[PDB]
Design a protein around this ligand. Structure first.
Ligand SMILES: *[C@@H]1O[C@H](CO)[C@@H](O[C@@H]2O[C@H](CO)[C@@H](O)[C@H](O)[C@H]2NC(C)=O)[C@H](O)[C@H]1NC(C)=O
Ligand SMILES: *[C@@H]1O[C@H](CO)[C@@H](O[C@@H]2O[C@H](CO)[C@@H](O)[C@H](O)[C@H]2NC(C)=O)[C@H](O)[C@H]1NC(C)=O
Ligand SMILES: *[C@@H]1O[C@H](CO)[C@@H](O[C@@H]2O[C@H](CO)[C@@H](O)[C@H](O)[C@H]2NC(C)=O)[C@H](O)[C@H]1NC(C)=O
Ligand SMILES: *[C@@H]1O[C@H](CO)[C@@H](O[C@@H]2O[C@H](CO)[C@@H](O)[C@H](O)[C@H]2NC(C)=O)[C@H](O)[C@H]1NC(C)=O
Ligand SMILES: *[C@@H]1O[C@H](CO)[C@@H](O[C@@H]2O[C@H](CO)[C@@H](O)[C@H](O)[C@H]2NC(C)=O)[C@H](O)[C@H]1NC(C)=O
Ligand SMILES: *[C@@H]1O[C@H](CO)[C@@H](O)[C@H](O)[C@H]1NC(C)=O
Ligand SMILES: *[C@@H]1O[C@H](CO)[C@@H](O)[C@H](O)[C@H]1NC(C)=O
Lengths: 99, 50, 50, 170, 49
């Protein structure tokens, strides 16, 4: 509705019998492959990201925000626990750090 | 010629891989929308008859 | 040729054969007067909406 | 072909030009309408050959390779259910290319989420895409993951009911 | 051609005005398209027609 991409803001400009909108939008770029999982299995419990997504660079698991790569250590502060590991399809084993 | 619809892109889908952006582009685009016309009035009697 | 308008001096370089002039609507816009051969411009009298 | 009629028709001026220009404007407006609706992507996406979407079935909406028209079964049913100086101009986009555009849109929204509509197509597993959509409506991801088989079964049943309802309602 | 949407509206309105002005040059089956010629050539019973 307000340009191609994720809309940030817009500027109006007057035109003869018309209006010109300068739509400022955010476009993602320089994407990178990662190995992802729906949940993390730890201590018999399933951990799900509060706002982000589990990614892996090949050996180590992190959680990052969805629209920008910013890897962080999977802790209890950024994950929540629901159920055991027997239900979620594709759950992987990784440690969950406790601050 | 028969026009092409787009460049062909195959998305590398698999059940455990995701693509995460590592950078961004601030893109400004134009959208032109007409608002009004020229306000024209026609004297019907003068146009038909003078 | 009948009509109503204000007759004024003009700067239109008519060729010798040329007598009158016509606009897009085909109404006469300039005329060459007989007897004196001068070229008179025909400008419609002021009008508009009240 | 009456020449006396056309000689008398020239007395009315440029009425025919106005009618032809209005019809030409309508004719290019139809192609503009189809262009604005269907050509919203400049990349033609395809689904992977293996349809492993975590139990979600899209065969009724993905194109059928066995059909020569390359239409989905739902689109094939939709196309089956619709039945002096005059000329009909063909549309600029054929039905095959409109079906190709819808196939590209379906492949983009299946394999890449809403990311292809805002930029480059970023792949994501479909049970993760669904979880993101669940979080968009305010339901936690765990609810989707725990009940993923039931949600896939409900989605497949609803898609089949859509095809049955279209095939059973005139 | 960046500003074609506004120029399209301007061209359509100017072309409609030009067509409306051009339609005065047509006689529509009458002897002349000029009213003064008809009023100076004919009696009112046929000038009325
Ligand atoms: C995945 O990321 C982690 C963290 O960025 C990497 O682990 C680090 O690797 C560097 C380079 O070998 C070492 O100097 C650090 O000591 C490592 N940190 C830890 C905590 O182990 C890891 O190497 C990355 N893996 C891949 C395949 O890129
Ligand atoms: C993830 O961890 C769980 C628990 O640590 C593993 O489940 C165990 O697997 C072994 C051998 O497969 C069994 O003998 C145990 O009885 C299992 N325990 C439980 C509680 O299920 C699981 O195999 C691990 N998965 C991976 C891929 O390493
Ligand atoms: C993520 O990985 C996939 C597969 O490993 C990459 O897709 C391949 O890209 C190359 C280069 O364009 C093609 O020649 C292959 O045909 C692609 N394979 C498939 C299965 O699509 C993809 O490019 C990677 N993405 C990133 C950002 O590196
Ligand atoms: C993210 O993208 C920007 C450009 O969009 C990169 O900035 C460029 O970096 C190169 C090399 O450092 C410079 O030569 C260019 O002049 C930079 N361009 C601008 C506009 O500043 C930036 O390096 C990228 N960052 C990452 C982490 O990939
Ligand atoms: C996805 O759905 C289609 C149709 O709903 C399934 O195809 C059916 O498969 C069964 C058994 O294999 C056949 O008896 C039916 O005749 C098929 N129907 C059609 C319309 O082809 C398909 O099995 C489902 N699953 C997958 C993985 O594609
Ligand atoms: C993904 O597919 C592989 C086979 O290609 C399978 O081993 C694995 O269990 C699948 N994971 C999920 C979460 O479906
Ligand atoms: C009469 O009109 C002619 C043009 O037909 C012109 O040459 C001549 O000078 C005029 N004479 C007078 C007295 O106006």
């Amino acid at each position: 509705f307000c340009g191609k991409g994720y809309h940030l803001m817009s500027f109006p400009q007057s035109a003869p019998h018309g209006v010109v909108f300068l739509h400022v939008t955010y476009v993602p770029a320089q994407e990178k492959n990662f190995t992802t999982a729906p949940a993390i299995c730890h201590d018999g419990k399933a951990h799900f990201p509060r706002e982000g997504v589990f990614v892996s660079n090949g050996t180590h698991w992190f959680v990052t925000q969805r629209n920008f790569y910013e890897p962080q250590i999977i802790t209890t502060d950024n994950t929540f626990v629901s159920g055991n590991c027997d239900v979620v399809i594709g759950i992987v084993n990784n440690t969950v750090y406790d601050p | 010629y028969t026009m092409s619809l787009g460049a062909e892109n195959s998305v590398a889908y698999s059940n455990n891989s995701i693509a995460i952006p590592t950078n961004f582009t601030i893109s400004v685009t134009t959208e032109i929308l007409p608002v009004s016309m020229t306000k024209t009035s026609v004297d019907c009697t003068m146009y038909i008859c003078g | 040729l009948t009509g109503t308008g204000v007759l004024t001096e003009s700067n239109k370089k008519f060729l010798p054969f040329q007598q009158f002039g016509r606009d897009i609507a085909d109404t006469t816009d300039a005329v060459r007067d007989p007897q004196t051969l001068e070229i008179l411009d025909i400008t419609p009298c002021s009008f508009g909406g009240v | 072909d009456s020449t006396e009629c056309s000689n008398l028709l020239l007395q009315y001026g440029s009425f025919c030009t106005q009618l032809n220009r209005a019809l030409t404007g309508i004719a290019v407006e139809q192609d503009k309408n189809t262009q604005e609706v269907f050509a919203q992507v400049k990349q033609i996406y395809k689904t992977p050959p293996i349809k492993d979407f975590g139990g979600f079935n899209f065969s009724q909406i993905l194109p059928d390779p066995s059909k020569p028209s390359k239409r989905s079964p739902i689109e094939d049913l939709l196309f089956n259910k619709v039945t002096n100086g005059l000329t009909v101009l063909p549309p600029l986009l054929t039905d095959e290319m409109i079906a190709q555009y819808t196939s590209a849109l379906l492949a983009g929204t299946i394999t890449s989420g809403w990311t292809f509509g805002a930029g480059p197509a970023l792949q994501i597993p479909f049970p993760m895409q669904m979880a993101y959509r669940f979080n968009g409506i305010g339901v936690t991801q765990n609810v989707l993951y725990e009940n993923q088989k039931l949600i896939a079964n409900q989605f497949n049943s609803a898609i089949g009911k859509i095809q049955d309802s279209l095939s059973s309602t005139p | 051609s960046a500003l074609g949407k506004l120029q399209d509206v301007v061209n359509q309105n100017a072309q409609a005005l030009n067509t409306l002005v051009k339609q005065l040059s047509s006689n529509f089956g009458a002897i002349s398209s000029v009213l003064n010629d008809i009023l100076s050539r004919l009696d009112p019973p046929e000038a009325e027609v």
